[PDB]
Amino acid sequence: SVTQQVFNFAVTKSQPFGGYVYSTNLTASTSSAVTSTQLTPLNLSITLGQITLSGNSLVIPATQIWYLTDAYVSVPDYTNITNGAEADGVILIYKDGVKLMLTTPLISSMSISNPARTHLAQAVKYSPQSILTMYFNPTKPATASTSYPNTVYFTVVVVDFSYAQNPARAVVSANAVM
Amino acid sequence: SVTQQVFNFAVTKSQPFGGYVYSTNLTASTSSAVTSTQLTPLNLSITLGQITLSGNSLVIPATQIWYLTDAYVSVPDYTNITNGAEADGVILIYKDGVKLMLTTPLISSMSISNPARTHLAQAVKYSPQSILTMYFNPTKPATASTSYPNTVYFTVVVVDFSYAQNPARAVVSANAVM
Amino acid sequence: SVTQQVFNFAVTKSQPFGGYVYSTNLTASTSSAVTSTQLTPLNLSITLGQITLSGNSLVIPATQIWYLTDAYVSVPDYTNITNGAEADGVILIYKDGVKLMLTTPLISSMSISNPARTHLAQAVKYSPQSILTMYFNPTKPATASTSYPNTVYFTVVVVDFSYAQNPARAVVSANAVM
Amino acid sequence: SVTQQVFNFAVTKSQPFGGYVYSTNLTASTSSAVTSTQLTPLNLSITLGQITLSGNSLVIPATQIWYLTDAYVSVPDYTNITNGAEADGVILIYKDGVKLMLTTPLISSMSISNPARTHLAQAVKYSPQSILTMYFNPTKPATASTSYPNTVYFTVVVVDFSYAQNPARAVVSANAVM
Amino acid sequence: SVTQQVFNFAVTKSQPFGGYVYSTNLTASTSSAVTSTQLTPLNLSITLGQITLSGNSLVIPATQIWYLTDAYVSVPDYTNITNGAEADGVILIYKDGVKLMLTTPLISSMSISNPARTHLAQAVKYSPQSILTMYFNPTKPATASTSYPNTVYFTVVVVDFSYAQNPARAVVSANAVM
Amino acid sequence: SVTQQVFNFAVTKSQPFGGYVYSTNLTASTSSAVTSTQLTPLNLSITLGQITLSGNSLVIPATQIWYLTDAYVSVPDYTNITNGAEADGVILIYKDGVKLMLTTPLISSMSISNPARTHLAQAVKYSPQSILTMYFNPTKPATASTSYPNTVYFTVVVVDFSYAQNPARAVVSANAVM
Amino acid sequence: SVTQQVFNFAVTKSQPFGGYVYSTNLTASTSSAVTSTQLTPLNLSITLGQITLSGNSLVIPATQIWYLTDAYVSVPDYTNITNGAEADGVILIYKDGVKLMLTTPLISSMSISNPARTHLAQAVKYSPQSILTMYFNPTKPATASTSYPNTVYFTVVVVDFSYAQNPARAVVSANAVM
Amino acid sequence: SVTQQVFNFAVTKSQPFGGYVYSTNLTASTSSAVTSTQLTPLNLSITLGQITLSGNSLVIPATQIWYLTDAYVSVPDYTNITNGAEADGVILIYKDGVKLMLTTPLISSMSISNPARTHLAQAVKYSPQSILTMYFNPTKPATASTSYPNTVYFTVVVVDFSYAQNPARAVVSANAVM
Amino acid sequence: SVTQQVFNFAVTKSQPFGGYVYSTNLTASTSSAVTSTQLTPLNLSITLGQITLSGNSLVIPATQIWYLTDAYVSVPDYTNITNGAEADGVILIYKDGVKLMLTTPLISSMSISNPARTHLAQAVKYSPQSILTMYFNPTKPATASTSYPNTVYFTVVVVDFSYAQNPARAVVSANAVM
Amino acid sequence: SVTQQVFNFAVTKSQPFGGYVYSTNLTASTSSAVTSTQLTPLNLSITLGQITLSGNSLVIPATQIWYLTDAYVSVPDYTNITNGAEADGVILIYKDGVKLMLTTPLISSMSISNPARTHLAQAVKYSPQSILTMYFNPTKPATASTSYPNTVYFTVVVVDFSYAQNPARAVVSANAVM
């Protein structure tokens, strides 16, 4: 229960400034059968409104604070990994292009069917506007024919301040406190 | 796992005002084999009245307070997902047609056959009349021929107030305290 | 003189607050030759501006109070019941789906061709918006070929607060006085 | 004709203790073509949730107070009484197996096609658990060949107490005043 | 400059209580080639969440105040009305299913292809929960073969309150002063 | 661990008045291959003295307090649902024939051969003498030849009071103090 | 953790009088392919000093206190039940041959591999000298050829006073408090 | 003259701090013949020093304040829409990529030749540095061969503070006032 | 799962006396395919300097305090149990050859492929020199031809005191407080 | 949730001194087909700026504090261990070339394909420069032809002090607080 402490913290702290906390899914898709070297995953986040913030390098909006909490891999993707239908490796998580903060431990290991699934080391906080980007470093790449792209799901805790009041003073006071 | 706590919370709070607490079954089902993009699941709720509330966008009746707690996916759906007979993805939960408050974590991973079947994080409140509506965001959609529609069953805790002295004044006094 | 007593009671109580009191013929028709089990009549009320509120489980408009007072059965229905061209049985009357208030005593004996037609037990009031569903539990069903659906006419005293100077909370404020 | 006075006597007296008043249908039927002497009618009451109490000597459940108010005989019995296809006579109504409380006035004269349809004198109150049994004492028995059994329908006012704060001390305090 | 006045009137009153004023587009479509009598169009608003709130008789949720302010008909519709490919007529705009509020002047004449098209008479507000429903009363129906359904677009100013600090009585406090 | 909390709660309250708390097993059997509509399962409990309280509409004895706590389905029943040898559906639980208590979520999904089966929502109490009745509302019914009746096992915590110093009213005072 | 709450309770109370607390495994094995009616399983406990208390109806020695805490079925025994190679059923647990205290919920359900496995209802204290005996009431008996016996394991927390200073007044002083 | 109320508002408030106010024309051009679903147009502003801020997602510099005042469609584009040579639809206007503020009413309607052209709903203030993006959700897409891309013109009032003494302290004192 | 709680208990308490805490692996293996009765496993521990204490009934060195925490069974052993190639049963743990201190819960249920893998209850503290012997009590022994010996691995925490200022007087004061 | 315990300890203890905490995947691989005796796996850690500390017996750089936390084995290794393509065994973990602090429990049981993977005993911290060496002590070595090297992945938390205003003596000053 590492997401739930973040959720209770975002509910408790962002309430007096006026703050709308919810949780969503982010999909990292490394397309087109990675087999040789380090590639770049297509990020795709779904916030309120069906905006579908897609493509590489999702800039956080100037009124929100994001919290990347956990990540996992779906069970047919794990079946494709262990049979050599798609590549295994790690995912490096960057902030503002320079700051490496996490390396996901070997995405074959974080299958959701295992109760002994290894998690991320920490829930990474993204401030107002900053460049979230990820990279896929493959070890033991895809070998068999008819290969499939890689997909890794993340869980984001979005704390919104845009609909509250003048959102600038609220978001800077909240990012100072929490 | 939260469905036993919000039931026990609903019983001990509505008793100063008088009220049913009971649980029903909600079925959300997208029509006809989602393969491309975001579709709409058809909600179908049954209540004590032997009355179906079909179609999209169910309206909560004027004296009830619902609670959306958990969800699960049966085994004949989960064998269709891994064989590519139907689409994976998440399900978005809207209130009043504007607000987004949850995203169900990857309907393959809340299947009844996964030993780590995941639950929903927190229960969704619904006051007197408001518009519950849902949307299905497909990631890795259906590819195989002779595909099948999705079906994801939910669990709603219903707090009826029809047996009080006046059901209209009682339900607007308990909606503030619960 | 049971319709005229609650009509006179409504027009003396809803009159200081503004009340458009009138009567309406309601129709409930269980469709297509009921022969085995518990069926469902399709409700129909013909309200003031010729709007035909149809379908099962009529939802009461937000500014109205209804009063189900009488029930009868036409002569071409009753001459078909005794010949086995349609089914007998009772009719259950619900409120919010959960509260049973009446059971109509044997719609063949509520016919109008008999000079001592039996009446209902009580006039059941009906608040602002609240569901009204009816259920048909047939005993001695239809036997002969070329059968016909049932038709049971009711008679409802409608109170209406739409054209007064106050919203849908003054309707409830004048409902608890009654 | 007495059903409307005792129903308003129930919804007013059983209201400060919490009381859910509604009406049902009871069917008494002597089996197998009464032609000589004292017969026994087979009672059949139908409470809400398809609770079919059957057989002779029904017992009132420990949360309800019954009232037996009126009776009627349908027309194809009354056209069989006058032709000697079934027996005439009265019906004796017992309580606790000891007291004789009423005698229904000549079941041929309570037919639904009599312009002077005779009703019952006063409604007989039934407390929690108490045996309601009936008896049929035929005068002018059945004489024609191919006879038919008798059927006399009743109408019961049921005062349920399942929704009070204390369903046991509410009944034994409301039985004293009603 | 009629919708720009009620949009400015909303943002001067939704400011002290919180509130999210935004403009939408409502699409009423009488399906499948009306040729004889009065039909019912399928109302379909598109809110912030790309919510296809479909079906007849939309319900305004408990935290929103709508304003129906405009109507127009596109050019490919208007070339079909004059050609006899779909029906002409007016559209009745009902509140709660009871009140008639307005009547549109002859939907072929509020086309957008003409430089001085007709307008509505007043901007109809809608309070918290009320049933917005419409009806299409055809005059000069479709005559030739391969006919088309009607479609008439509207323009709604929606005053939302779901993101306020307590969206339960802020919407009933601002409904008074507006 | 759901029965083990309501068991320890029962032995904590019923001990200073005397009380024989123990656990039984109840078997509900929808007879002979349901394929169309709502049917009636045969309740069959086994109390201490090999007394088989059978038949529909069980009456709880006057000296016992039952607790319905758990439900599950054996493996050769669950392999009959998936092959179409018996019907799926839900189970409605009515207390006193009026009050609905719960609705079991889809008896194929509380099978015991799955590692993550679903649970009930709350432990239902049943007072001194009361009528427990159940109904099986089938969805996706049986289709194959040589079909079988349904069977769903429960688990009852029974608080017997027959061996106290005076077992007449102590069973209801200890019912109310819980 | 029901066994751990008794183990931490036994070492707290039996410590000042001096008392050896440890856990063991009691094996009730119904002999040779139960197929028709009620059987009697051979209990077999393994205490400390190389001794094996076998046979039915184990007499507890006068210096020990036993606590029957949990019950489970091994995985190769669960495979034999679901294939019909051995019988299913429940287990009756008696004290002094007479008092029925528990009934195990359907031993096919309590397979140790499933994490959602229903346990015993409560940890049963067995006093100094007092007979422990069990019975196996089968339902769905063994059908297949080459059938097998039944085996259900148990976990007993055993408190011992035989090495104390005065084994008479240590037991009767610790049986009261503990 | 909604721009002239804004242009005379900008030259009055930004004058004590020193600030350049002028108007320009922003071009939203969906590329290459939208025919199926939602696309994204390329914003293209023309600032002072001969630059063309092309590409999606215009970033406001840290010294400027923008105002989106009206919208229209050129007459050769309105000829191409009504003849089916390019697509019709609405346009969504976002602030910070998330907050929807307007939905332009059906861009075929706002042709500059009609005097009865529906304008933009409101003049949107775009704060300092903050993403501006637009989307085009088509209805009745382009059908005819040799189709053309879309173009929708906008009028932007640019308030500029880059020539003050301190361009940091000038904006943050005038963004609060204006 | 108890390994991490006893490890920090050692490195906190044995640290003021001078203490060197680490972990190792113990291998217990009964030879030659147990099929009849109680067997003896060959203990084999590996301390740091390849100190291979082997054979039955190991002796603890005079400056260490051991801790036996968990145990596990690998999958090529678990597929031999369910195929009948090696025996099931529990393992009894003695200290000084006299006291029985623990019983490992059914080594087929301690396997590494059980999603509910059972651990040991409490770690058994082993002082300086104290004969650690184990025994295997087989229930349902091996039946198939070509059977295999058992192998059950353990986990030992060793608290060494070889580096204190007086290694003999340090243990006898640290064993007294740990 | 053992990696996140020392990661949260690192980010709150190295924060007043200035410290950039992140995670890193480590690799240890015994080269070229271990078959008889004790071998040596080649360590390989990739710190963020693509400098690859390789070879046996890594030296920690002067401004970093490491924490060796997790270990696992990928699935193409675990299919090779059980099939005799590479060796089983344990791994010993040293520090400063003198201290043994861990032993991994039989790396084939530390595989990731099993739902009950066993973990390490404790998170081993690592000071500024101190040699980190590992040794492979195999049991049951490689048997089959075409054998493979071993690979065991780790997970290390790296604390980095490169951005402070103090040289490498603040690092050991923050090693004195941790």
Residues of A within 8 A of J48 (CB-CB) are 100
H84/E76 CB distance under 8 A: yes
Three-state SS string over A20-53 comes to EEEEEEEEEEECCCCCCCCECCEEEECCCCCCCE
Tell me which amino acid residue B135 is.
Y
**E contact chains, 3+ CB pairs < 8 A:** A, B, C, H
Residues of I within 8 A of G67 (CB-CB) are none
Distance CA F155, CA G15 (A): 37
Residues of G within 8 A of F116 (CB-CB) are 115-116
Evaluate whether chains H and G are touching (3 or more beta carbon pairs less than 8 Å apart). Answer: no
**Cα distance from A153 to chain B (closest Cα, Å)?**
9
Residues 6+ apart with CB under 8 A from G15: none
**Structural contact between residues A47 and A159, judged by C-beta atoms closer than 8 angstroms:** no
SS3 H12: helix
Q: Which residues of J touch A (CB under 8 A)?
A: 1, 3-4, 7-8, 11, 22-25, 48, 70, 72, 74-76, 112-117, 153, 155, 157
Beta strands in chain B (DSSP E): 22-30, 41-46, 52-53, 58-59, 64-72, 88-95, 99-104, 124-126, 131-139, 152-160
**Cα distance from E54 to chain C (closest Cα, Å)?**
18
Helical spans, DSSP H, in F31-91: 75-81
User: For chain I, which residues make up each domain, given as ranges?
Assistant: 1-178
Distance CA D104, CA D136 (A): 10
Test the A interface: residue of B39, B91, B109, B143 with most A CBs within 10 Å: B109
Phi-psi region of B83 (alpha: psi -120 to 50; beta: other; left: phi over 0): alpha
Distance CA C150, CA A105 (A): 69
Burial class (CB in 10 A: 0-12, 13-18, 19+), H9: middle
**A contact chains, 3+ CB pairs < 8 A:** B, E, H, J
Distance CA C25, CA C158 (A): 10
C98/B48 CB distance under 8 A: yes
Distance CA H111, CA A170 (A): 41
Residues of C within 8 A of D153 (CB-CB) are 105-106, 109
**Structural contact between residues E117 and E71, judged by C-beta atoms closer than 8 angstroms:** no
I20, β-bridge pairs:
I160
Distance CA F125, CA F135 (A): 18
Distance CA G156, CA B154 (A): 40
Residues 6+ apart with CB under 8 A from J152: J27, J28, J29, J41, J71, J72, J73, J91, J104, J107, J110
SS3 B147: coil
DSSP codes, C63-74: TEEEEEEEEEB-
Residues of B within 8 A of A112 (CB-CB) are 106, 108-109, 114, 116, 118
Q: Which residues of A touch B (CB under 8 A)?
A: 3-4, 7, 20, 22-25, 27, 46-48, 50, 72, 74-76, 79, 112-115, 117, 151, 153, 155
SS3 I10: helix
**Cα distance from G139 to chain F (closest Cα, Å)?**
11
DSSP codes, C77-95: HHHHHTTTSS---EEEEEE
**Cα distance from D174 to chain C (closest Cα, Å)?**
20
Distance CA E104, CA E120 (A): 6
- Give rounded-to-5 percent helix, strand, coil for chain H: 15, 35, 50
Helical spans, DSSP H, in chain G: 3-13, 75-82, 167-177
Residues of F within 8 A of B117 (CB-CB) are 116
Distance CA H37, CA H137 (A): 7
**Closest Cα partner for G162 from G154, G153, G172, G170?**
G170
Q: Which two tokens stand for residue F77?
A: 């029943």
Evaluate whether chains A and H are touching (3 or more beta carbon pairs less than 8 Å apart). Answer: yes
J25/A122 CB distance under 8 A: no
Question: If you measure CA to CA, which chain B residue comes closest to A21?
Answer: B101
Distance CA E119, CA E108 (A): 12
Q: Which residues of F touch C (CB under 8 A)?
A: 36-38, 98, 100
Question: Entry resolution in angstroms?
Answer: 3.7
**Structural contact between residues C49 and E94, judged by C-beta atoms closer than 8 angstroms:** yes
**Cα distance from F99 to chain G (closest Cα, Å)?**
28
For tokens 């709350």, the residue is F122
**Closest Cα partner for G29 from G84, G62, G65, G73?**
G73
Residues of C within 8 A of B49 (CB-CB) are 57, 94, 96-98, 131, 133
Question: If you measure CA to CA, which chain I residue comes closest to J88?
Answer: I74
Residues of C within 8 A of F37 (CB-CB) are 36-38
Distance CA G28, CA G41 (A): 5
Residues of E within 8 A of C63 (CB-CB) are 96, 98
Residues 6+ apart with CB under 8 A from J76: A82, A140
Residues 6+ apart with CB under 8 A from E67: E6, E10, E123, E124, E125, E126, E156, E157, E158, E159
Number of separate helices (H) and strands (E) present in chain G: 3, 10
**Structural contact between residues B162 and C98, judged by C-beta atoms closer than 8 angstroms:** yes
**Cα distance from B103 to chain F (closest Cα, Å)?**
21
**H contact chains, 3+ CB pairs < 8 A:** A, E
**Method by which the coordinates were obtained:** cryo-EM
D72/C103 CB distance under 8 A: no
Three-state SS string over chain D comes to CCHHHHHHHHHHHCCCCCCEEEECCEEEEECCCCCCCCECEECEEECCCCCEEECCCEECCCCEEEEEEEEEECHHHHHHHCCCCCCCCEEEEEECCCEEEEEECCCCCCECCCCCCCCCCCCEEECCCCEEEEEEECCCCCCCCCCCCCCEEEEEEEEECCCCCCCCCCHHHHHHHC
> How does G110-135 read in b/e, with b if 16+ C-beta sit within 10 Å?
bbbbbbbbbbbbbbbbbebebebbbb
**Cα distance from F95 to chain D (closest Cα, Å)?**
9
Cα–chain center distance at I15: 24
Q: Which residues of C touch D (CB under 8 A)?
A: 2, 82, 90, 99-103, 105-106, 108-109, 114-119, 121-122, 137
Q: Which residues of I touch G (CB under 8 A)?
A: 81-82, 84, 88, 90, 92, 99-103, 105-106, 108-109, 114-116, 118, 121-122, 137, 139-140
Distance CA D42, CA D133 (A): 9
Residues of G within 8 A of F22 (CB-CB) are 100-103
Evaluate whether chains E and C are touching (3 or more beta carbon pairs less than 8 Å apart). Answer: yes
Residues 6+ apart with CB under 8 A from A153: A25, A26, A27, A28, A71, A72, A73, A74, B106, B139
D26, β-bridge pairs:
D45, D154
